[PDB]
Design a protein around this nucleic acid. Structure first.
Ligand SMILES: Nc1ncnc2c1ncn2[C@@H]1O[C@H](COP(=O)(O)OP(=O)(O)OP(=O)(O)O)[C@@H](O)[C@H]1O
Ligand SMILES: Nc1ncnc2c1ncn2[C@@H]1O[C@H](COP(=O)(O)OP(=O)(O)OP(=O)(O)O)[C@@H](O)[C@H]1O
Ligand SMILES: [Mg+2]
Ligand SMILES: [Mg+2]
Ligand SMILES: [Zn+2]
Ligand SMILES: [Zn+2]
Ligand SMILES: [Zn+2]
Lengths: 614, 409, 303, 272
DNA sequence: AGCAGATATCACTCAGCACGA
DNA sequence: TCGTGCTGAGTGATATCTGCTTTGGGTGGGTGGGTGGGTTGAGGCAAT
């Protein structure tokens, strides 16, 4: 009988197919547990139930096709140890056999179970297998020629990924004489164009045309991978390897992401020049990836509501924001209110009123100010870290650049644009370019960035809050001089921040002693950072407070009283919009849809304390 | 929309059958297969389907071959003879896509003409042409024959669809003047080796035989005068001619083949029906003698050739071909004729999943015939091992052994 | 051999354009409007298409737009002929040059809008909509559409030579006597050209994954859709995803042929490509553009 | 039936003649005598010589093809090809006896599974400062590493590379256009790699300078840099005891810098 | 040296006739 | 109507000769382009 054998070996394809089918049909995780010397963790329900049968059933239910296989499970089964070794040694043929067997079992399940599921849909699908955990991960520097055409594991950091490349699968040809069409498959990238028309009646030789847009294509993408920092032996430039991903694996990993990839180590000849079949002696190595790994519910809503119902929610959130910062309750409260933010109003006849809150953190350099910004970044769902006059940062304004990679013109958005809807923390506000200051003024005034350079006229949304930090001109902030002189910023730009905080490191025996105790000990419940971020996201997404009559009366009375204090002008209309925003944010914090007198009272107090510093 | 949905479903089934030949992974995956022959020699093939299947492996082995045997086709430009494009050379299935209103108008015009003056026009044309036969050029012969055939067939179809409008409007075809004119035209075209006029006369004669069959179906007593016509038209020379047509058909275009097939079918139909109904005198007609006349290697060859092009034919052509095959294999018991390899290869192609749609009556005919043919072939092979060799080659013509080969006794 | 399925699509399309109503006829009136103002483009709402014919016609056009587009134009011309016979011909003395009109079919109101990062090879030849920010716009150029050539030897004329992505010439003289095969000269007087523009777009900043380079795509505009997108705008294009070959490889008159570290290997085996390989590029052919972001004359405009 | 190199599972290298052994037997050891890049002339081509210098560049390990295995789709036979050049032309047509006899035209397809590959690495060796003449620029010589010697050379190490000095002829149109001028490289064969506590340490930091005990102690504290940085609350106190020296010209600031940088294993010296 | 176009000399298919069966 | 040559010119086909051009670098140019590469150094200009 014809007997099919993998080229260069003595392994029968029929044996591999039957072994894999038996393994898939009958396998339980208890075998893996006993293999891993974890037999005493075996339960009675999950470990005694078929695993891959359930996986196939769930795949059919969800309509997916790809199957994730743990190579160790093959060792966990007596029959498939040889199959595991063959997969490690001859991956291409074994993988093709596994795909066909997976399709066969998928159809056989429906055939045997006489289910009502449509069979034609199944027959027209393509099935694949994605093995992983095939042994210890090697290094990019340990790949010798002996590893060619063998399955390897490699950990690294993604550096770049080319756009989707169309890869040809089936070629479509048309007859120029009889309008007859035929599809010819492609093998090793070689199109098998007919010599002549296949029609008996029309035997016209050499009259076949390839219709490019009517052919079948596939997705391909090339990714550059760099070895992990620990793999560098001395500290030289880390090496890199090229990866290829097809179909579903495309767009499965972005730049800067640490991933683990399983694939086949392959070598391909490189043509000397474009005119000729001549090849270079040296071969190029790459990896044909087959598997990639990266290294709100009802219960969540119930937990959020329970937390909101707590009486001391404000203090709890303030403490959770900055556990490591000592005795800055007011600053933490202001930061919390900024994080929650006010209500964005989209007015017909009026225009746009911003609901963001801006806070300036100025004072002595000894006190902790950058750590607060880092915490705010860690908490805010959206935001970017930047320092004025900083080359490392991407930038505060949109700019037109050249894509070195592609030699293409690309419009890149700045830090403020990327922070749309979030909090943008600027570490060093004091030192900043004039241009950057003008951009900041425009963003805080119009909330949009406009660029009219390089033949492009566009406006980018920048609806983001700002939390900047500043330092005095000298080694300390002089109380005698006014804040404007000390901070060294234009009065206009300094008058746009809703809350201005002057954290000063006055020399006090008690305060110094307590700070020393806190710092040395570093060598009231607190919420996890993840839960706080989720709470902030939910509050900002769902709750929208509205002002009531009592709130209106309280706001009017408070503004009138503040104005009557001072001729010197104690407060301006900006001090009213700031109070409105702060009250709305506080109402947001309590998950309330109505602003009440308590929120207005809290707002007047936070605004007044900053004014008193001013 | 309904027809579009049906066609889309048909294309979906075709694509589904095509899918089994495509690899899930990309082309450059690089799977290599080694296949072992009955002797210990290994052949190499590439592709996932090769590893997972054997029939695909052999198909790829075949397909990969570079050498092609030359095929020479005898093509005649219609413009050379001055004729226009017509049913003779138009590809089978070429459909004129009318609009609903235009189709209604054309049908009404044709119906009115057939009910008003087709009889008189045919009579006048036949008189004028039989008076001036020799001066005919090829164009006039083809024109007259095609017009007659088309209108007779259209009236037959409309009579089938509608019980009102009936054969009496085209009854002038039956009259002997037109019949003898057509017979003389066809016979002369045959004799002089003018194949286009031959084709036109073939079509006209097929329509005339279908018409006469319908008239006999109408009324027997009124069809005694048409039994006269049947006796006249089945003259021994005519029998011979009609039999010869198929034997030569294999040489010429597809359309020639199809017309041959259809005329053969009609001839056998009328012969059998009129032998069963009553006795026939031209010289008495021996239906078995005619049948036997029809049983030779060229006929079969012709049939095979025609059936090879089954992806363009309808179900009616396949039905007629396999009716003929049934006559051959069962009624005539001339099975040695069909114990060939062209038929086996073609039948594998027909019954393969990629060949013919499963939901089709043509596949039902093919499957039944294949079952019977395989059973009889297995019995013969069990009897005579020599037939394994025999299959490969044309029949022997040896007095000694010929009988043995043909009939096994 | 005829395309039976394509003809039925044309038959269904003719009914949709001639009988659809919402109660005055929608597209019959529109065809009349183009007749008065002598307009080329005809706009069809995709939402309307899905209603008629149970949705079979809409689904067929969606998957296979490149295949069925020529048949849609055949159906449109037939309906135009019946109700606007003078519309087929393009718009003191007798004008000798009046060629047939080049109708353009524009679709819009697709149920889904895709991102540039969501474009895959499975949708090549399908009708879909994308959104992006215009970065660069090329100038308007004439594109060869239906070329006409004259025989060098016998002065014979060959007309209606459809052009692929590359320059194309005849191979066989229509003159029985003439032996000329590979000696032709283009005739610009009888040729037909179309407006052509190249638009470069990139995905919107909000859609961009944080800390990632914007993705870029090439959009080609033809006919009346030219110069409808300006750099910096945010536009929504509706059209067909296509694949663009390397025309260089294929062989061009007078042109010598000739990210990924050499792993982008093209397809080979073609006769044209004797020892070379063919690479492919994803592009977009747009048929509809929407940019998301004296007293007597004025009085007439107002209702 | 197959090339001998196909089945070879070993690599051969030549160890130069040691000077001591040569002097014992009254012979001159040309191979083991160190030479500079300049001293390697055209008359040394094809000989076993040693080069002394500093490696400035090492490339990644790549597979170099030596024997290529093909397959016949029709025949079922395997063909082999030997590569001894920069470039090679792949086979296209079957040459088997069966194919020839039967007249069957079978295409040859490359098979990387059965091919033979050897690890390849290209390195650059540059002249040492003391070897360059007066008013001359240093020169570099290419090195080719094959087999198990790969990864034996790294940038910045002074080595005594022993190899066979050979030319690298061009191929095709380049060969014709170049002329008689030839490139050269070295086939690596052997690589020889060249090599009260507080007060005492402070004084031994920089003996050549005049006693500055406090500065030396500060330098020790910077060098050791002991710290426990495990806060785990989001940040961690910096674990580096940074030191800044500022003074008028005349103090040995450069000497402290150079000495403390030399002692440190990761010390890096830079100039603003 | 390799590749693409071309010339020209190499066979093979259907064509058909004489003898006899 | 089978078998066996003899004739035969037509319709191929495939085994067989005749002319580019290339690498990359100004010992092919700037009426082939600068988004197919080269490319670090000096120089002039505007915004700063
Ligand atoms: N209330 C506090 N709680 C804890 N640590 C504090 C507090 N105030 C100051 N510190 C300490 O002060 C130091 C300030 O470091 P940080 O990075 O915040 O400085 P900075 O504000 O950016 O300084 P500069 O203006 O000099 O750049 C940190 O070590 C922090 O531990
Ligand atoms: N204590 C010292 N004992 C001996 N030589 C010393 C001492 N201090 C400085 N020198 C000498 O001073 C010379 C110049 O000073 P050196 O370069 O060491 O440092 P520096 O004056 O701080 O440098 P710079 O001029 O670059 O600011 C050196 O050659 C060094 O020999
Ligand atoms: Mg700071
Ligand atoms: Mg110094
Ligand atoms: Zn054809
Ligand atoms: Zn001509
Ligand atoms: Zn071979």
């Amino acid at each position: 009988e014809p007997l099919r054998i993998i080229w260069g070996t003595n392994v029968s394809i029929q044996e591999c197919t039957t072994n894999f089918r038996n393994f898939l049909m009958s396998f339980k995780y208890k075998f893996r547990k006993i293999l891993d010397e974890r037999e005493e963790f075996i339960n009675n329900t999950t470990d005694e139930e078929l695993y891959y049968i359930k996986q196939l059933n769930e795949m059919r239910e969800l309509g997916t096709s790809n199957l994730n296989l743990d190579a160790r499970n093959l060792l966990a089964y007596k029959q498939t140890e040889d199959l595991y070794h063959q997969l490690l040694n001859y991956p291409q043929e074994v993988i093709s056999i596994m795909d066909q067997t997976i399709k066969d079992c998928m159809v056989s399940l429906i055939v045997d179970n006489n289910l009502d599921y449509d069979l034609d849909e199944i027959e027209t699908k393509f099935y694949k297998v994605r093995p992983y955990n095939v042994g210890s991960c090697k290094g990019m520097r340990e790949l010798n020629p002996n590893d060619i055409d063998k399955l390897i594991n490699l950990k690294g950091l993604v550096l770049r990924s080319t756009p989707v490349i169309p890869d040809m699968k089936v070629a479509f040809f048309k007859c120029n004489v009889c309008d007859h069409t035929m599809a010819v498959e492609i093998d090793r990238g070689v199109i098998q164009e007919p010599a002549r028309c296949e029609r008996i009646d029309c035997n016209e030789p050499n009259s076949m045309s390839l219709i490019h847009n009517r052919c079948s294509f596939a997705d391909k993408q090339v990714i550059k991978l760099q070895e992990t920092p620990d793999f560098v032996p001395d500290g030289q430039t880390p090496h890199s390897i090229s990866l290829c991903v097809y179909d579903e694996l495309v767009d499965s990993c972005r730049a800067g992401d640490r991933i683990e990839v399983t694939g086949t180590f392959r070598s391909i000849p490189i043509r000397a020049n474009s005119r000729q079949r001549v090849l270079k002696s040296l071969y190029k190595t790459y990896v044909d990836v087959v598997h990639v790994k990266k290294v709100i519910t009802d219960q969540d809503l119930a937990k959020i509501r329970e937390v909101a119902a707590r009486e001391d929610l404000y203090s709890l959130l303030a403490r959770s924001i900055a556990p490591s910062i000592y005795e800055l309750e007011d600053v933490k409260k202001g930061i919390l209110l900024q994080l929650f933010g006010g209500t964005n109003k989209t007015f017909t006849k009026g225009g746009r009123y911003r609901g963001d809150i801006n806070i300036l953190l100025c004072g002595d350099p000894s006190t902790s100010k950058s750590q607060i910004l880092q915490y705010v970044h860690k908490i805010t769902p959206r935001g970017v870290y930047t320092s004025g006059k900083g080359s490392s940062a991407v930038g505060l304004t949109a700019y037109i650049t050249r894509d070195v990679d592609t030699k293409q013109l690309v419009l890149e958005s700045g830090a403020l644009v990327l922070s749309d809807g979030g909090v943008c923390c600027i570490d060093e506000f004091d030192k900043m370019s004039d241009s950057t200051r003008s951009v900041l003024h425009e963003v805080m005034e119009q909330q949009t960035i406009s660029i009219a350079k390089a033949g492009i006229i566009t406006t980018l949304n920048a609806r983001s809050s700002i939390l900047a930090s500043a330092n005095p001109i000298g080694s300390r902030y002089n109380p005698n001089l006014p804040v404007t002189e000390n901070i060294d910023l234009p009065p206009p730009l300094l008058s746009r921040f809703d809350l201005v905080y002057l954290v000063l490191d006055k020399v006090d025996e008690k305060n110094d002693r307590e700070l020393a105790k806190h710092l040395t000990n570093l060598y009231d419940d607190v919420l996890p950072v993840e839960f706080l971020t989720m709470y902030i996201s939910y509050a900002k997404e769902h709750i929208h407070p509205i002002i009531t009559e009592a709130a209106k009366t309280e706001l009017v009375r408070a503004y009138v009283g503040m104005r009557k204090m001072g001729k010197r002008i104690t407060a301006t209309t900006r001090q009213l919009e700031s109070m409105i925003r702060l009250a709305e944010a506080h109402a947001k914090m309590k998950l309330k849809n109505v602003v009440e007198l308590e929120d207005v009272q809290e707002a007047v107090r936070l605004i007044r304390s900053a004014i008193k510093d001013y | 929309g309904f027809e579009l949905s049906k066609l889309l479903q048909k294309e979906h089934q075709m694509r589904k059958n095509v899918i089994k030949h495509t690899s899930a992974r990309h082309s450059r995956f690089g799977g290599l297969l080694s296949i072992q022959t009955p002797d210990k020699t290994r052949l190499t093939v590439s592709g996932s389907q090769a590893l997972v299947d054997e029939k695909i492996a052999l198909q790829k082995l075949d397909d990969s071959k570079k050498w092609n045997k030359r095929i020479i086709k005898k093509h005649q430009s219609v413009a050379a003879e001055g004729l226009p494009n017509s049913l003779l050379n138009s590809q089978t299935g070429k459909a004129i896509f009318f609009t609903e209103s235009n189709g209604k108008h054309f049908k009404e015009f044709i119906n009115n003409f057939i009910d008003s003056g087709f009889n008189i026009l045919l009579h006048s044309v036949t008189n004028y042409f039989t008076t001036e036969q020799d001066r005919m050029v090829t164009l006039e012969q083809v024109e007259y024959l095609l017009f007659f055939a088309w209108f007779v067939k259209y009236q037959l179809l409309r009579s089938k669809i509608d019980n009102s409008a009936d054969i009496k409007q085209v009854s002038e075809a039956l009259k002997e003047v037109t019949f003898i004119l057509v017979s003389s035209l066809l016979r002369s075209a045959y004799d002089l080796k003018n194949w286009t006029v031959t084709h036109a006369g073939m079509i006209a004669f097929n329509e005339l035989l279908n018409l006469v069959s319908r008239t006999k179906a109408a009324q027997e007593e009124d069809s005694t005068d048409i039994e006269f016509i049947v006796s006249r038209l089945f003259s021994d020379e005519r029998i011979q001619l009609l039999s010869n047509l198929p034997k030569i058909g294999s040489k010429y275009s597809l359309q020639f083949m199809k017309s041959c097939i259809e005329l053969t079918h009609s001839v056998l139909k009328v012969l059998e029906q009129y032998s069963d109904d009553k006795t026939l005198v031209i010289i008495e007609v021996n239906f078995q003698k005619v049948q036997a006349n029809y049983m030779t290697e060229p006929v079969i060859e012709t049939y095979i050739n025609f059936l090879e092009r089954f992806r363009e034919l309808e179900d009616d052509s396949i039905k007629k071909v396999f009716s003929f095959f049934h006559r051959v294999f069962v009624q005539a018991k001339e099975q040695a004729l069909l114990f060939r390899f062209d038929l086996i290869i073609l039948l594998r192609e027909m019954l393969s999943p990629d060949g013919l749609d499963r939901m089709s009556r043509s596949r039902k005919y093919v499957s039944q015939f294949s079952d019977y043919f395989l059973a009889r072939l297995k019995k013969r092979l069990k009897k005579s091992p020599a037939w394994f060799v025999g299959l490969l080659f044309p029949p022997l013509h040896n007095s000694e052994v010929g009988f043995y080969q043909r009939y096994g006794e | 051999v005829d395309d039976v399925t394509g003809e039925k699509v044309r038959e269904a399309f003719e009914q949709f354009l001639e009988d659809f109503s919402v109660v005055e006829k929608v597209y019959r009136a529109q065809i009349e409007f183009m007749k008065i103002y002598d307009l080329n483009t005809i706009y069809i709402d995709y939402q309307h298409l899905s209603m008629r014919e149970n949705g079979a016609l809409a689904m067929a056009i969606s998957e296979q737009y490149y295949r069925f587009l020529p048949f849609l134009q055949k159906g449109l011309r037939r309906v135009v002929r019946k109700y606007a016979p003078e519309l087929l011909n393009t718009s003191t003395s007798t004008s000798p040059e009046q060629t047939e009109r080049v109708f353009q079919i524009s679709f819009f109101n697709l149920p889904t809008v895709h991102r540039i990062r969501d474009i895959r090879s499975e949708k090549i030849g399908s009708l879909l909509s994308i959104s992006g920010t215009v970065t660069r716009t090329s100038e308007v150029r004439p594109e060869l559409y239906k070329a006409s050539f004259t025989c060098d030897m016998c002065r014979a004329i060959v007309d209606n030579v459809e052009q692929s992505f590359k320059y194309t010439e005849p191979t066989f003289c229509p003159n029985p006597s003439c032996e000329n095969r590979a000696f032709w000269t283009l005739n610009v007087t009888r040729s037909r050209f179309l407006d052509w523009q190249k638009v470069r777009i990139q995905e919107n900043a909000n859609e961009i994954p944080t800390g990632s380079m914007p993705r870029t795509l090439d959009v080609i505009l033809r006919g009346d859709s030219v110069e409808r997108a300006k750099p910096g705008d945010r536009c929504k294009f509706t059209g067909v995803e296509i694949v663009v070959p390397d025309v260089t490889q294929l062989g061009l008159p007078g042109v010598k042929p000739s990210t990924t570290e050499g792993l982008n290997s093209g397809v080979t085996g073609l006769r044209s490509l004797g020892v070379r390989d063919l690479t492919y590029k994803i592009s977009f052919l747009a048929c509809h553009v929407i940019s998301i972001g004296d007293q007597e004359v004025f009085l007439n405009s107002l209702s | 039936l197959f090339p001998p190199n196909l089945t070879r599972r070993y690599f051969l290298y030549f160890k130069p003649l040691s000077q001591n052994c040569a002097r014992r037997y009254r012979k001159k050891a040309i191979s083991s005598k160190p030479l500079s890049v300049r001293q390697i002339k055209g008359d040394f081509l094809g000989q076993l010589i040693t080069v002394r210098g500093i490696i400035t560049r090492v490339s990644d390990v790549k597979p170099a093809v030596e024997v290529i295995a093909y397959t016949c789709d029709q025949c079922g036979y395997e063909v082999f090809q030997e590569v001894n050049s920069r470039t090679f032309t792949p086979l296209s047509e079957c040459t088997s006896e069966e194919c020839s006899q039967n007249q069957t035209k079978g295409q040859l397809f490359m098979s990387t599974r059965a091919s033979k590959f050897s690890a390849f690495q290209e390195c650059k060796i540059q002249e040492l400062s003391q070897q360059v003449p007066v008013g001359h620029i240093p020169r570099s010589l290419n090195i080719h590493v094959n087999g198990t010697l790969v990864r034996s050379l790294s940038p910045g190490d002074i080595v005594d590379v022993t190899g066979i000095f050979l030319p690298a002829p061009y191929t095709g149109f380049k060969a014709l256009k170049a002329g008689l001028l030839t490139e050269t490289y070295l086939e690596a064969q052997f690589v020889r790699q060249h090599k009260d506590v507080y007060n005492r340490l402070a004084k031994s930091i920089a003996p050549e300078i005049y006693g500055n005990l406090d500065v030396k102690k500060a330098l020790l504290l910077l060098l050791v840099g002991g710290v426990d940085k495990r806060v785990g609350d989001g940040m961690k106190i910096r674990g580096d005891i940074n030191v800044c020296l500022m003074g008028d010209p005349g103090v040995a600031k450069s000497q402290l810098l150079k000495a403390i940088c030399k002692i440190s294993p990761r010390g890096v010296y830079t100039t603003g």
